[PDB]
Amino acid sequence: GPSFPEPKVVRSQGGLLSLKLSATPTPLAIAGQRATLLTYGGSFPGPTLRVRPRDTVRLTLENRLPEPTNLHWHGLPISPKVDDPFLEIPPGESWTYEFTVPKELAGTFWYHPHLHGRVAPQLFAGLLGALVVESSLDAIPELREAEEHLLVLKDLALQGGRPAPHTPMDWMNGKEGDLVLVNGALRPTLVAQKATLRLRLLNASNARYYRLALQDHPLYLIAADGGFLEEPLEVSELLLAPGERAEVLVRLRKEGRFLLQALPYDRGAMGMMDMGGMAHAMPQGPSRPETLLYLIAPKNPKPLPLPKALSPFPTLPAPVVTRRLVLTEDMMAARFFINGQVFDHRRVDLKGQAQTVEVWEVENQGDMDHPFHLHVHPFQVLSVGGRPFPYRAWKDVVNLKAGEVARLLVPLREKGRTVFHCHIVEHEDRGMMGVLEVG
């Protein structure tokens, strides 16, 4: 096939994407070895769904797993009666998700399980796929003439031909794997045919961070999790926390081979040491550097000029309330808290009003990085750690290093009961999640 593996694409037809997926234990070849993964559509990653604003999506999920499951439509500002974090599809049963893609929406989204207590083993085992919302902005020449690729960043560990089981330490840190894969391939080669590449990036890992850097090149950020920036932003590196997405333009500068790497990054994962009657937690330190892919530039590359403008960010109404959500940790218990409480599906933690804007101050009082995710209601990051954000764009995951406060501007959209949680999904399963009700 093509030198660069990407998930098969399913496109809406006539304004309708009607599709049946099964979540099933699937024998596969992955990274040169045979393993049984849990997949949607028989593949890892699952198929990429590609849709347009105002399309109807009709996705029937058939659960062929031995445990209940469901879907989270991560990043989609749709009803929590559709993107239902409390729904359980029992083994052998099916459920049809039907929604209309919102009109003012563009970017890279994804789908994965969100059954409390079950998310980390199910996601680690292979249950995820991308959803792309096309934009009329994709027709401007500076994007249309770029070479587009999707990069699903997701790691894996295998034991006896199956995903490695979670250990106690995995529930504390979030599980990372030794196979650091792009679209399920081990260090694929991307032989570019155009000088400008448009890369859609998805961190679909349970816990691994990707400190992205391309050798000898900057990246031009053009979209965050949930939409375009107002204009391209040049960056020397780009950190993608679990659950985050970005879109970047790469302008290949000369012929040659260039490594896309995940540089060393310390997210505060912990180990255990015994140095003479000790048995105390100790930092793992930064991750070892990983090569993600080999990028081969074409001959005499002449990149396109960057687009001058992308999408204006909406002027939001003045906010009517300020929230505070403090994250804390009990590491040795592998328990994780929001304002001192663990998740309770029967308990409503916040009550807000549809079509108002809230300021959420999320404070990480732990020592690990925690990537904070809100369902249903995309937000504008105003600042993190007291540093203003350098762009305006919709996000739905914001990473907090130890001690950092993030200030979010949160327009409340669809009415109903939804959730917010750490997207180190082991921490969510272990309690770091709360309930928002919008009325």
Strands 129-133 and 48-51: parallel
Query: Is the separation of the CB atoms in 100 and 55 below 8 Å?
Result: yes
Neighbours of 313 (CB within 10 A): 15
User: Would you say 68 or 298 has its CB closer to Cu ion?
Assistant: 68
The one among 121, 184, 226, 243 contacting Cu ion by CB under 5 A: 243
Sequence letter at residue 408: L
Compute how many residues bind Cu ion; rule: CB under 5 A: 8
> Measured from the CB of residue 316, what is the shortest distance to Cu ion in angstroms?
23
Instruction: Pick the stretch among 91-99, 145-153, 211-219, 362-370 that binds Cu ion (CB under 5 A).
Output: 362-370
Cα three-residue angle 375-412-315, rounded to 5 degrees = 115
Establish if 245 lies at the interface with Cu ion (CB under 5 A).
no
Q: How far is Cα 71 from Cα 185, in angstroms, rounded to an integer?
A: 24
The one among 114, 118, 154, 395 contacting Cu ion by CB under 5 A: 114
Query: Is the separation of the CB atoms in 211 and 179 below 8 Å?
Result: no
Task: Give binding residues as ranges.
Answer: 72, 74, 112, 114, 280, 370, 373, 375, 421-423, 427
Establish if 116 lies at the interface with Cu ion (CB under 5 A).
no
Strands 9-11 and 48-51: parallel
User: Would you say 218 or 243 has its CB closer to Cu ion?
Assistant: 243
> Measured from the CB of residue 2, what is the shortest distance to Cu ion in angstroms?
28
Strands 179-182 and 185-186: antiparallel
Instruction: Pick the stretch among 63-71, 134-142, 187-195, 241-249 that binds Cu ion (CB under 5 A).
Output: 241-249
Structure token pair of residue 113? 């399980």
The one among 40, 74, 172, 295 contacting Cu ion by CB under 5 A: 74
Establish if 130 lies at the interface with Cu ion (CB under 5 A).
no
Beta strand extents in 215-348 (DSSP E only): 219-224, 227-235, 238-240, 245-251, 256-263, 270-273, 280-283, 290-297, 321-330, 335-338
Establish if 424 lies at the interface with Cu ion (CB under 5 A).
yes
Task: Give binding residues for Cu(2+) as ranges.
Answer: 72, 74, 112, 114, 280, 370, 373, 375, 421-423, 427
The one among 123, 158, 297, 422 contacting Cu ion by CB under 5 A: 422
Residues that bind Cu ion (CB under 5 A): 72, 74, 114, 243, 370, 422, 424, 427
